[PDB]
Write a protein that binds this ligand. Sequence first.
Ligand SMILES: Cc1ncc(COP(=O)(O)O)c(C=O)c1O
Ligand SMILES: [Cl-]
Ligand SMILES: [Cl-]
Lengths: 443, 443
Amino acid sequence: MNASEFRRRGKEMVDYVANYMEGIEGRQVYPDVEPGYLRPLIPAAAPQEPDTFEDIINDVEKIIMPGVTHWHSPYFFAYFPTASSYPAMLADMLCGAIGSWAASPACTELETVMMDWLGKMLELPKAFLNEKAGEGGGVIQGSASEATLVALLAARTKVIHRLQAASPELTQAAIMEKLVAYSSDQAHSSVERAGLIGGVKLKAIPSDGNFAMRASALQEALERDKAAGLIPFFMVATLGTTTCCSFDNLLEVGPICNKEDIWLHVDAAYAGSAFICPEFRHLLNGVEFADSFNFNPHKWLLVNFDCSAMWVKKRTDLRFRSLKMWFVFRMYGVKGLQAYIRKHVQLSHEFESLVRQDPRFEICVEVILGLVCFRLKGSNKVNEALLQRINSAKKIHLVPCHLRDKFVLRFAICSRTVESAHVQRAWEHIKELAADVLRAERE
Amino acid sequence: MNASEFRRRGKEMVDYVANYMEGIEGRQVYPDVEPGYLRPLIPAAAPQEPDTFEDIINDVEKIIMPGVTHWHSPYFFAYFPTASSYPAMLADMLCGAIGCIASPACTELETVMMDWLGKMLELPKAFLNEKAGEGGGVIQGSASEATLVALLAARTKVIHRLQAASPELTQAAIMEKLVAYSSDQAHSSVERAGLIGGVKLKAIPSDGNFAMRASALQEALERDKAAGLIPFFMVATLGTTTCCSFDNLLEVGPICNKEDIWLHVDAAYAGSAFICPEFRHLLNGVEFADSFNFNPHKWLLVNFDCSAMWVKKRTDLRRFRSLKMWFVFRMYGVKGLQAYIRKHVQLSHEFESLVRQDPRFEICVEVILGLVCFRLKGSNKVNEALLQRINSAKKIHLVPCHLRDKFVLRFAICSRTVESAHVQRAWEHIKELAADVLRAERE
Ligand SMILES: Cc1ncc(COP(=O)(O)O)c(C=O)c1O
Ligand SMILES: [Cl-]
Ligand SMILES: [Cl-]
């Protein structure tokens, strides 16, 4: 098609897309249609002459939509990794119209500036800023896995140089066999992968009663290891774990890392975004000690998933993406974005209220942000039974996890469209299915 | 923002983009901006309250446009890794709204579209799976990835096979001896696949027309089997990166078969043109192939992230890519697509015959489809000069290569809206600068 066909069909498409997102409340969260349904609804060969736009869209409603998930609804109470905000979509259109530094000076420079915005919003130390400070800095990464790996390699290179300076005798290989890294029991898969790929031993630290790393468990691990002739060099402290919103106590853990020459990497998961709100900055106290800090802004800052933001204390140790950051930051403002997290935290606590009022259910971890870790009091069996009925019903979606050896229902309020109405109706449904599940238990 | 706001601003973006595409001749393809220009133009921190869309789009024109490479320009006469068509743009809007990366319609629309495109290319039924056939097609992220998935597939096959015969043989001992091959003109992607796959890669010498022939291949194989190595993988290229030459698939196919070597046919650029009867013959021999791959996003107007690959045996073997195809096929129709291809071939021939009409220039390689390999008669040095004026004048832009020892100017016609008139203006500009380059030679 030409340009002015596009102005029309494009505007038409903005309309279709808007509608979708407005009435998404109605759609069923899971497709209620089976593998195999599609082949016979569509011609066996491609059309020779062009079909109408009119006819294609109808086909998307009638043929494609039923077979689609609809992760963008308020009733999908799990993190939806590939969601996108409206400003992200606007950018995404322009980002595709355009299509190294030399190739695109705007792409690169905007990266450097947007990281600064992000840095200031979170109120990270000044040292972390790319504002020409000549020290520290920040860069975008594809995955939080990449970041964890970069910090690790950097930490590894660093300890090797230090240890070989002390004793010129030792071999690089000799040192590597002895290197240990640490993370909390609730550390993300992306840490295991980092150490696997980086060629060092990874050990979990026992977390406390609230699933946080508390030093005493850290110090012990260090004593056990230093004396078996191993060498701690690197550690990930998690802020906002993926199992529950658990925060590793940075104030206890950092001072140890400094003393023991351990490199402190802070994996702020998705939670990091919350530090643009003052109520949460105390969870970040201790960042002073950390050598690197990583988080994914996507979940709470509405930016693109493609982006994992990461800073370092010293720059020397170490897709058109900043455009979407720019749009989203500019179209919500800090206060808008704050308003946003703040709304979800409140809906999360509204849900929590509901769970405390039903004596059949217990809450497992302190609710800090959007996620609520809750379960039915009893055996794991009972609860596995329940999550099955919730999914079977295809009305809402929840994902579980284990905590120690306990099966836990995660209720996650992340979606853009969520209101308390939805939480209200969601609770009740869960409530009704528990009733049904509970009868069964007695048989 | 909210839905009703997306409506207003989604449609404003739709215009902005059409405007950009209509005025794209005005733009200078390559940005000429001084390092560090962006920062003084963007505020030090994020805004607290939202900015205006007017102010945000104004900034795109002023701040972002000058720092971008306008790939879609008709005057950018090299291959453009992103082929953005309007109906591609429309599906992105939709994929955007139904976040994808589980749903019956991802997998099925994929299979169906792969039989559509397979039928269009007149592939052997063995590669299509609609008559219950065991073969079929999957869409990959890039040819680089598709080639690696094929290599690894072969490596597994061959390892399972030799170990079926000899249970005392270890994966380790077999890998040492594994050889794969491709044309001395084959795309780097192959090199990277052997490295990750950890096998030896060897280049087969091409002939007078930069084709891989039977003679040279079989020479290679005997040399390597006699050394006690193991051929397992073989890449044949249809449409080389260098001069668009075609490996002789009919010659090489049968050799791979009786030598029990996995045959992967890579057609990344030129595969699309096999939807035209005129060109389908170059693909004869696929029958012998084990896996066939090419990139439609290159020349079939699908947006960039989309590489298509069929295999004879699926058991040998992220984004919702099949929707972008479905849009593009339905909105162009087969006749519309074939038209798009034949346009580019034609302009390619228009250019070729302007270069012949001039006694100062030679054609280097047979001009098969859409790329022209030309040269000013005399020394490489005269020709390095000429490219250095073109690339300097900033009007149009060309990427050279070497053909054996000859320095060659490539001229790719590949962009949604190159027309006859662009070609001539371009050729006029080449001749001006050449008569200049020839004046220098006299001095
Ligand atoms: C011959 C050949 N092989 C492989 C590739 C890689 O294609 P892609 O950019 O999709 O990875 C190309 C160009 O894209 C090519 O021309
Ligand atoms: Cl979170
Ligand atoms: Cl504040």
